């Protein structure tokens, strides 16, 4: 429970998010460890969800 | 409007999710915990009655 979706720096601007399961309207979606880049010279927010564009 | 434990075929937008139970032929095939101990729930999107600027 404690390490679920923990966001840690991998290298450079690339950050590693651990595995974890989310519930969307009662449907369970499991995500493996993944990597995502931040935005340079900025305070970015790493979250899970859907955007208006996507 | 009384608050109690209920079983439905659809999770309400306002509820406390406990479990999702898939059962067949009078027997339970699977139970999935929907609590925060197991999954991170994506919150429902509830729009306000009055649009911004109205």
């Amino acid at each position: 429970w404690y390490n679920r979706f923990r966001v840690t720096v991998q290298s450079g601007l690339t950050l590693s998010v651990t595995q974890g399961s989310i519930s969307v309207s009662g449907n369970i979606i499991s995500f493996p460890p993944q990597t995502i880049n931040a935005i340079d010279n900025a305070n970015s927010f790493v979250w899970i969800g859907k955007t208006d564009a996507d | 409007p009384a608050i109690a434990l209920r079983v439905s075929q659809t999770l309400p937008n306002v509820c406390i999710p406990l479990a999702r139970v898939i059962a067949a032929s009078g027997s339970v095939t699977s139970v999935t915990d929907l609590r925060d101990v197991s999954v991170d729930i994506l919150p429902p999107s509830i729009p306000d009655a009055v649009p911004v600027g109205s």
């Binding site: 595995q19 499991s30 460890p33 | 898939i22 095939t29 699977s30």
Partner: peptide
């Protein structure tokens, strides 16, 4: 390390069964 990566990053039978019979 390769085994841990495999365990974390691959779909387990229970999850895939439950989602497959959930839709």
């Amino acid at each position: 390390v390769v085994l841990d990566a495999l365990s974390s990053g691959k779909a387990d039978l229970s999850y895939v069964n439950t989602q497959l019979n959930s839709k």
